[PDB]
Amino acid sequence: VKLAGNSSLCPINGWAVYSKDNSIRIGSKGDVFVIREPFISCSHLECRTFFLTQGALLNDKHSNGTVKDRSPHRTLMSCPVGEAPSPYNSRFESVAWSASACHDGTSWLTIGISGPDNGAVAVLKYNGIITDTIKSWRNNILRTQESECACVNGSCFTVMTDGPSNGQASYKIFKMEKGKVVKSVELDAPNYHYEECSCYPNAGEITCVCRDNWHGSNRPWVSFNQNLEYQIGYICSGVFGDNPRPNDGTGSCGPVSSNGAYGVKGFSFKYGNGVWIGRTKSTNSRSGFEMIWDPNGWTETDSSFSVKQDIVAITDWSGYSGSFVQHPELTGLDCIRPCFWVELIRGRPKESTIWTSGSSISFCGVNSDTVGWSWPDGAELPFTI
Amino acid sequence: VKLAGNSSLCPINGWAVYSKDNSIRIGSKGDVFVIREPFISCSHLECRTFFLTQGALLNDKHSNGTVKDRSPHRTLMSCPVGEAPSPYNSRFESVAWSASACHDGTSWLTIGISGPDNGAVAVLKYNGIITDTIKSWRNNILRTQESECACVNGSCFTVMTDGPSNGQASYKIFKMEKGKVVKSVELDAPNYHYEECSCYPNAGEITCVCRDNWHGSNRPWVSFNQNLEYQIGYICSGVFGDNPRPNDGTGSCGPVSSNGAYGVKGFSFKYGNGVWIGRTKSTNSRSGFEMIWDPNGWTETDSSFSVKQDIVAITDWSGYSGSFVQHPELTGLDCIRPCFWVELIRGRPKESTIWTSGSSISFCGVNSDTVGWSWPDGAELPFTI
Amino acid sequence: VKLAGNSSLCPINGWAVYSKDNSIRIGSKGDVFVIREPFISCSHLECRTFFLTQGALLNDKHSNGTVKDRSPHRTLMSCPVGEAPSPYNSRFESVAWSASACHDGTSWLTIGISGPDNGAVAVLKYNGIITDTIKSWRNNILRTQESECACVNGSCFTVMTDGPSNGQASYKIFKMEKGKVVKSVELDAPNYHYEECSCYPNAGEITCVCRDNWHGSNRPWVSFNQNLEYQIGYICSGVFGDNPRPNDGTGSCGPVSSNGAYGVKGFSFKYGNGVWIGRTKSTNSRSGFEMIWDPNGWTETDSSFSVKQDIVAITDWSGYSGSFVQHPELTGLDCIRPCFWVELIRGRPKESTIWTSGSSISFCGVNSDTVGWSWPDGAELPFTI
Amino acid sequence: VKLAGNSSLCPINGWAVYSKDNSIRIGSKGDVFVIREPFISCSHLECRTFFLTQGALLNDKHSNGTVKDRSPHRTLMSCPVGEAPSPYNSRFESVAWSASACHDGTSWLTIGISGPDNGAVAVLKYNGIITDTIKSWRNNILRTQESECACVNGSCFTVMTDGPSNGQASYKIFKMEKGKVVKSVELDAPNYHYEECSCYPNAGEITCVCRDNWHGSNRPWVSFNQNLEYQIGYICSGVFGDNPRPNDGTGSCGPVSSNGAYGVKGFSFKYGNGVWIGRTKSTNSRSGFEMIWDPNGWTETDSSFSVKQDIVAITDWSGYSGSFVQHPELTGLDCIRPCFWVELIRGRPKESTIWTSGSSISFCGVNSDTVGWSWPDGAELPFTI
Ligand SMILES: CCC(CC)O[C@@H]1C=C(C(=O)O)C[C@H](N)[C@H]1NC(C)=O
Ligand SMILES: CCC(CC)O[C@@H]1C=C(C(=O)O)C[C@H](N)[C@H]1NC(C)=O
Numbered sequence A, B, C, D: 001v002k003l004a005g006n007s008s009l010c011p012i013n014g015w016a017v018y019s020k021d022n023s024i025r026i027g028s029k030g031d032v033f034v035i036r037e038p039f040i041s042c043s044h045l046e047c048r049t050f051f052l053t054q055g056a057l058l059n060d061k062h063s064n065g066t067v068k069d070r071s072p073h074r075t076l077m078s079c080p081v082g083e084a085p086s087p088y089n090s091r092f093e094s095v096a097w098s099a100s101a102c103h104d105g106t107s108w109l110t111i112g113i114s115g116p117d118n119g120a121v122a123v124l125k126y127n128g129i130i131t132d133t134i135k136s137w138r139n140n141i142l143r144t145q146e147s148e149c150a151c152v153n154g155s156c157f158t159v160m161t162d163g164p165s166n167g168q169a170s171y172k173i174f175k176m177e178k179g180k181v182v183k184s185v186e187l188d189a190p191n192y193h194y195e196e197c198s199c200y201p202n203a204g205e206i207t208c209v210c211r212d213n214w215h216g217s218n219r220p221w222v223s224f225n226q227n228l229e230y231q232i233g234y235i236c237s238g239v240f241g242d243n244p245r246p247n248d249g250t251g252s253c254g255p256v257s258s259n260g261a262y263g264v265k266g267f268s269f270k271y272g273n274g275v276w277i278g279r280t281k282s283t284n285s286r287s288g289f290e291m292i293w294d295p296n297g298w299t300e301t302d303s304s305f306s307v308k309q310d311i312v313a314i315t316d317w318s319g320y321s322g323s324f325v326q327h328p329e330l331t332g333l334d335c336i337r338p339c340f341w342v343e344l345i346r347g348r349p350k351e352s353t354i355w356t357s358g359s360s361i362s363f364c365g366v367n368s369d370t371v372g373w374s375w376p377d378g379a380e381l382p383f384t385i
């Protein structure tokens, strides 16, 4: 039976460690895929880890310039959470250098994008079989979430971008049933910039917190009904969420220009006017990670907050981070539980190696107490190469 | 319940990437099988990749002269689509240096040929247990499809050749049920030459497009009803499908002798008087791949065609290619969906390695739009050896 | 249906070899996890081996200081009994450097403790999803069993410690249902020291034999009802079970102070006033192992016993050992079968390697005859390093 | 439902190849266990390969003196037929240096002997849980089949030996239900010698053809009803089946003393007064294998025969071989089908390496035709060592 998403986000006090895959430490010897853009998404029975491989293993020559981003060998595969991604435990999903995926209660929907930069195509699959296709409409790198999509009452939603990662680009929301596009709407978002959105379902509606790689240090959002009627904005909190970003201060409900000319994928959970913010600890590099609870931070502008919980130390490498949900039909709870993952990027451009790849760690909602600490990748570089 | 095959091929506009195993790039370090002759075939529940191993792994000494073709260690195995063939994820099917396979809706049927060249024997299995045997009748390398057989209303059919790959040889169509040959017929096709046929079910009948290794540059075909009543011909198009072959020009409905003394296994999908032709890009070697729609090309002699979709660039190695299907019981559609796979050969005799193996990529029908691009093997030879 | 735990320990005579994973001998080449603190636990259908990896593999550089005990990369995983723990056959369970686990008949309950020594938090999971959390109440290394928990009539119970591994500490017994803590009690055990308890169900109650690391050469025990009403004491048998320990002699029903300033993890099965004692053969190091039947050494003080059954020769490295149970719902028997496992520790600090890890062996109850022997680890150190 | 064993052996004309695992060729690089004494057995759903590992992998130092036979690290494991035995694809079964196993229609019954030569104990397991124990009764290496046991109407029977491999030893037949010994009888076989019997069910009774290591070149046999009422004898054919053995000549219905002071495990299928013999091609060493049809050869004494089918050239190493069956509940047939396997031993003592391991190949009855050929191991020694 389909996942009803009419339930609300579960109240919580902190975050508890859920998984850690040590893929990079293990891959030092083991046959572990070199990856990037990993993300967790759960069905009504299990939770999986999706990722984009480089069609090569760690410590092998084919792992060479795996910093390039888009290639013909890039593929989307999955394995159960906490496990190291290997050819011996990974399920093939699709050929792709940018992807998304979600479970509607019945079957899995995977979105993989491949092809050249001037005409990339999104192949949609439902239970492994191709159910639709979406071709680039601006011919400038059609790309997507790199985190799970959201399903509600049997419909799943996602967000895509086409155009410059440099300035005004085109943005679209898509609704799908059985992996087929039943409706789509382009957002009329002049001056906004949307990339790699982390979307979750709450009370029958979707909410997405994304990345402004053009000119924002704070994160932009988009929420919508099952008819794609939407609203847009930026988190007004002075506790800036992008990286790079400036020192905390006075935020704005609009794009914060200072230092937001690049970025990193992230997420945030909205509760009333409050927001849980996941962000790096550094303001310049993808180092460290922490969770901050700013009550009344979604609508106000100030750098004051209530709680902060360490996830990774400033001295250790972090990277992308996304949100993922647990539905009542998998949990037995009467609310939609929030969790998040963090990508731990090793290699280039920061480290002198011939390769780039990443590990993952994840946490979940919870009302019981927690603790901040540091759960870093742990590999010692360089490798035998 | 048995796969019904009374439906027609789904109408289509282009091809959407379905998978890429990256086995060779992965095998540089991973315990991946050395193979050749890989093909895809689906049941009413999953799609799998079959292939002929060389009882050895990549980058190991036993990988030596793996260019030999036939030997006692050659075995037919399978794993899920897109995954690299390895001993930790592959199901053993049969001992064979030539095979075929298809699912009738109930169980898998596998056909593996082993034994000496002067008296080979095909072993038929149904759900993993031997159900029949077919021994060579001409005593000269009994061989078969190297791709999926076709099943209709409980019956599965295949084609086998016995005799010279050099000139006139004998060809037989077999009809089976629960893996037992209930009927067969020897094709009265003087001056024709059949090999590595790609057969597919359509409107209750089978259609096979094969390879002329004796004297044809265009491909031969055979279609037949469930009682083995058949018709034979050659694709008349001036867009020659074999490799080697001559530059495009005036085709023929009979064997085009120029350059057809050799060949490569291939496929083609017939729609009315039109055909989707899959072929290499080079006219001499196994380089590149492309999809071509020549309406009225199945019966007409002209090198004019409508659409062209690139799959593999001329600068990269390709190889065998075959057709495979997605029945309604698996898809939910009301038509039989056409898909294809391409074998990417690396090593001897074109590269200076001590071995020969291959990777695979596959695509499927689709009405939505698509894009041409290039999805090559990507491994850099030579290996550590 | 829930595992009723109202049956009694089956009457037995000796122990029969159940399993041996040779993980270390195998990892010399294979991709085996470097581990410690392993233990078995069974459901109503299968038996698994749980363990705490070091987020690295044998014979790889990351295997370095794997002697350190606690780290962020330490994770709790599991695989079927007898199989070598590997990233290709292990299910991820939880991030932890101390754990426990058991099956209530319906789903698996896992307990993984992580975080800093001054603020560790226990993450309880039921069927893979977080259901409760427990933070350190004495801010001094919250730790647990390192062996299975015990479930009765739908409820599972475990024991945890917080405070000095050096002297008087704080001990608590928890009661959980579907992984949620419904009740907890602190033992009023002045002068006692509980650590790494082995608890088993019997006649509707729980019995634990633990490790006194503070000042006992004999072992302490706790037994309690389903409402956490309890009783405490020490095994009085002059056949001292802790290691190190003094030569056998006159025991005590309280802490035997000579040599018991350290210890190792163990177990014991109480029968009437008698006991089956598992122990190392050495009085000083974790060398050798043997089972001893002191009929009524549970309450009596005399170093005399009836049967001795060798499990590992004095010349070979041994280590931790714990109890694990079969239930009637799994076995079909009408009694609770006792079984135990043994950790074979190789590496530091006794051998000159840069790492520490371990193999496992197990035995089960049984009435028919048996024989003692020696089933050591068998790996030859050092390794390629 | 239980496997009725009331049907008779299926009439056959030759033997078709069923599988080949290439375990050693693959092990050159892959993580393949080192093993000996492999054998196949089938349930009502699938066929598996059991084997006794040496607790190490090929091409690793721990693969050293793996020629010793018995050791504490020896374990019984299994994987699907055709697959190379590895720690990634192998199910653990029991600790043993001698074993047997069979499926009764409901669950697997495994038999694993371990312990010292003067007190070995066989641990029986039903569905993975210990159901009985049998201790040595002569204190001289209790040993068993090293192939599959036979099940009929819900009962499985096996054969065990205790005593000298040097002369008169004690032989016993065991009958078990759900893994528990319900009856047992000791054979009154003076001047007979039974070891490593291959037993198959037929018309509700069991027939075993074994190895005489004492003083016989021909093979001894025992057949018995479901109440262990039995009959013994020796195959009378002058086509001697043991190895070593003298050149073919005049056989004997009793022990043929010339050259039978040692031997190898083998098998045979009796049809009326005829027999299908499996044997090596060489009379001195375990080289080559072949099937021979000697009608009226079970009771007569002559070296003449009707059919001979080659399985392994004399130029290549063979080794143990045994029988296995496929019941009607698996095949759908109305008769019990005969098949067999052959162990291809490589290394010591015939080859200069530091190890000993084996590969496997198997065949099945079949009415259709077949062919003789040579399917050897194919590994090139020595290895990197
Ligand atoms: C094309 C711009 C896009 C959005 C900023 O770049 C991403 C940034 C990345 C990054 O900043 O690390 C890595 C992503 N793999 C890349 N996505 C693609 C499709 O190339
Ligand atoms: C024997 C002739 C036959 C048909 C052309 O050769 C094939 C051509 C091949 C090729 O052109 O690459 C490889 C196939 N492995 C081989 N088949 C067998 C059975 O050896």
Ligand SMILES: CCC(CC)O[C@@H]1C=C(C(=O)O)C[C@H](N)[C@H]1NC(C)=O
Pocket: C036, C037, C069, C070, C097, C098, C141, C143, C165, C195, C196, C213, C263, C264
């Ligand atoms: C903190 C004291 C505790 C009980 C004695 O130490 C254990 C002893 C050990 C040992 O004596 O070998 C190894 C365990 N990994 C360790 N547990 C933790 C959590 O560090």
Ligand SMILES: CCC(CC)O[C@@H]1C=C(C(=O)O)C[C@H](N)[C@H]1NC(C)=O
Pocket: D036, D037, D069, D070, D097, D098, D141, D143, D165, D195, D213, D263, D264
């Ligand atoms: C102990 C005598 C017995 C029967 C002849 O020896 C077998 C012969 C063998 C052989 O001749 O190769 C190998 C078996 N692994 C061995 N079995 C045991 C248990 O040691």
